Amino acid sequence: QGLGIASLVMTVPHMSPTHWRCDLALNKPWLLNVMNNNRGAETCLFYRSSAQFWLDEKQLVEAAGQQPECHLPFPMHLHWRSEIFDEITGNRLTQEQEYAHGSWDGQEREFRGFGRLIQRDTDGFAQVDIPTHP
Amino acid sequence: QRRIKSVSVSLPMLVGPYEDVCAQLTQTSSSYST
């Protein structure tokens, strides 16, 4: 799945078809995914696999015909998106991030960051009077 | 000089578990009058 949490995978070499899987795990567990205060602050928090980001990168790399040297031999799994919703007014704030050239120490065997980081953001509005200009 | 001793074949393929692919090869003729 590249999901950073596994699925069951099997072959039954009896018939010509043989393979089967179960996606037992829908999300990686143990990630603090909602923050709230009873005053009226609340959040939806979102998280994504480095292997998935790299698949997007590799897709673009080969669209450029470039050579893959994004050396990062591990699917770390990382923050992707968050929404903050105002419990009172029902407006909200959208913020999202992306990153490229995940990086690794081939001698010390350790993480070395990303080559590039990107952020985007808008509110969402209870309001068309506000056109966002993201 | 060169003469054929033996031959074998290999097929990059996918096969059913118990699928016995069926095919055959034959020689029509050969040089050097063998």
mmCIF file of C-alpha atoms in Angstrom, chain A residues 21-117:
data_model
loop_
_atom_site.group_PDB
_atom_site.id
_atom_site.type_symbol
_atom_site.label_atom_id
_atom_site.label_comp_id
_atom_site.label_asym_id
_atom_site.label_seq_id
_atom_site.Cartn_x
_atom_site.Cartn_y
_atom_site.Cartn_z
ATOM 1 C CA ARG A 21 -4.999 -9.182 0.536
ATOM 2 C CA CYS A 22 -6.740 -7.677 3.544
ATOM 3 C CA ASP A 23 -6.306 -3.974 4.344
ATOM 4 C CA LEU A 24 -6.792 -4.622 8.052
ATOM 5 C CA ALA A 25 -5.203 -1.278 8.947
ATOM 6 C CA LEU A 26 -6.954 1.819 7.618
ATOM 7 C CA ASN A 27 -4.690 4.361 9.360
ATOM 8 C CA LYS A 28 -1.517 4.217 11.387
ATOM 9 C CA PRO A 29 -2.619 4.209 15.043
ATOM 10 C CA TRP A 30 -1.298 6.282 17.929
ATOM 11 C CA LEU A 31 -1.366 9.683 16.229
ATOM 12 C CA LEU A 32 -2.906 12.578 18.147
ATOM 13 C CA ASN A 33 -5.491 13.440 15.538
ATOM 14 C CA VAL A 34 -7.962 15.807 17.232
ATOM 15 C CA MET A 35 -7.176 18.739 19.512
ATOM 16 C CA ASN A 36 -9.916 20.583 21.376
ATOM 17 C CA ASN A 37 -10.673 22.895 24.220
ATOM 18 C CA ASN A 38 -14.141 23.095 25.646
ATOM 19 C CA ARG A 39 -14.013 26.847 25.055
ATOM 20 C CA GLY A 40 -14.674 26.184 21.365
ATOM 21 C CA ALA A 41 -11.360 25.363 19.716
ATOM 22 C CA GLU A 42 -11.292 22.103 17.767
ATOM 23 C CA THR A 43 -9.116 20.583 15.038
ATOM 24 C CA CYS A 44 -8.960 17.885 12.377
ATOM 25 C CA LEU A 45 -5.366 16.725 11.837
ATOM 26 C CA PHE A 46 -3.947 14.864 8.831
ATOM 27 C CA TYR A 47 -0.882 12.820 8.214
ATOM 28 C CA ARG A 48 0.735 11.067 5.257
ATOM 29 C CA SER A 49 3.480 8.613 4.275
ATOM 30 C CA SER A 50 6.839 9.781 2.947
ATOM 31 C CA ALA A 51 6.728 6.879 0.506
ATOM 32 C CA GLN A 52 3.493 8.293 -0.911
ATOM 33 C CA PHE A 53 5.023 11.740 -1.234
ATOM 34 C CA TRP A 54 8.031 10.138 -2.938
ATOM 35 C CA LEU A 55 5.740 8.279 -5.312
ATOM 36 C CA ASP A 56 4.347 11.652 -6.319
ATOM 37 C CA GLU A 57 7.918 12.908 -6.665
ATOM 38 C CA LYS A 58 9.005 9.899 -8.723
ATOM 39 C CA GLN A 59 5.969 10.369 -10.954
ATOM 40 C CA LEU A 60 7.104 13.908 -11.675
ATOM 41 C CA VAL A 61 10.773 12.858 -11.923
ATOM 42 C CA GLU A 62 10.000 10.387 -14.689
ATOM 43 C CA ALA A 63 7.633 12.901 -16.278
ATOM 44 C CA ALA A 64 10.819 14.972 -16.503
ATOM 45 C CA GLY A 65 12.857 11.888 -17.405
ATOM 46 C CA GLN A 66 15.113 12.776 -14.475
ATOM 47 C CA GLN A 67 17.072 10.257 -12.381
ATOM 48 C CA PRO A 68 15.848 9.176 -8.917
ATOM 49 C CA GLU A 69 18.434 9.894 -6.224
ATOM 50 C CA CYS A 70 16.008 10.907 -3.458
ATOM 51 C CA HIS A 71 17.934 8.582 -1.150
ATOM 52 C CA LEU A 72 15.677 7.915 1.851
ATOM 53 C CA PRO A 73 15.330 4.171 2.404
ATOM 54 C CA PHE A 74 12.486 4.358 4.933
ATOM 55 C CA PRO A 75 8.767 5.206 4.823
ATOM 56 C CA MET A 76 8.631 7.755 7.592
ATOM 57 C CA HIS A 77 5.111 9.089 8.007
ATOM 58 C CA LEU A 78 4.449 12.753 8.535
ATOM 59 C CA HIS A 79 2.046 15.666 8.882
ATOM 60 C CA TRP A 80 0.146 16.670 5.793
ATOM 61 C CA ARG A 81 -2.942 18.779 6.457
ATOM 62 C CA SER A 82 -4.903 20.347 9.252
ATOM 63 C CA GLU A 83 -8.228 22.104 9.744
ATOM 64 C CA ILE A 84 -9.078 24.275 12.729
ATOM 65 C CA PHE A 85 -12.821 24.760 13.107
ATOM 66 C CA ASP A 86 -14.312 27.542 15.216
ATOM 67 C CA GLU A 87 -17.040 25.780 17.174
ATOM 68 C CA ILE A 88 -18.856 29.111 17.532
ATOM 69 C CA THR A 89 -18.994 30.906 14.187
ATOM 70 C CA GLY A 90 -18.540 27.784 12.077
ATOM 71 C CA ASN A 91 -15.722 29.321 10.064
ATOM 72 C CA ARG A 92 -12.487 27.361 9.837
ATOM 73 C CA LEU A 93 -8.805 27.510 8.870
ATOM 74 C CA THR A 94 -7.186 25.174 6.320
ATOM 75 C CA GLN A 95 -3.404 24.714 6.292
ATOM 76 C CA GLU A 96 -1.416 22.109 4.364
ATOM 77 C CA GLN A 97 2.209 21.239 3.657
ATOM 78 C CA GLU A 98 4.366 19.280 1.214
ATOM 79 C CA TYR A 99 8.055 18.442 0.948
ATOM 80 C CA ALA A 100 10.589 17.034 -1.472
ATOM 81 C CA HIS A 101 13.990 15.330 -1.576
ATOM 82 C CA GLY A 102 13.676 13.440 1.673
ATOM 83 C CA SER A 103 17.230 12.960 2.882
ATOM 84 C CA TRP A 104 19.339 10.329 4.640
ATOM 85 C CA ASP A 105 22.855 9.744 5.993
ATOM 86 C CA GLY A 106 24.184 6.706 4.166
ATOM 87 C CA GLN A 107 27.156 6.490 6.561
ATOM 88 C CA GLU A 108 25.712 7.444 9.943
ATOM 89 C CA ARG A 109 22.382 5.864 8.997
ATOM 90 C CA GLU A 110 20.256 8.844 9.946
ATOM 91 C CA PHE A 111 17.685 11.310 8.634
ATOM 92 C CA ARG A 112 18.870 14.480 6.887
ATOM 93 C CA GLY A 113 15.635 16.430 6.250
ATOM 94 C CA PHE A 114 14.003 17.437 2.973
ATOM 95 C CA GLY A 115 15.429 19.405 0.100
ATOM 96 C CA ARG A 116 12.303 21.550 -0.125
ATOM 97 C CA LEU A 117 9.291 22.465 2.016
#
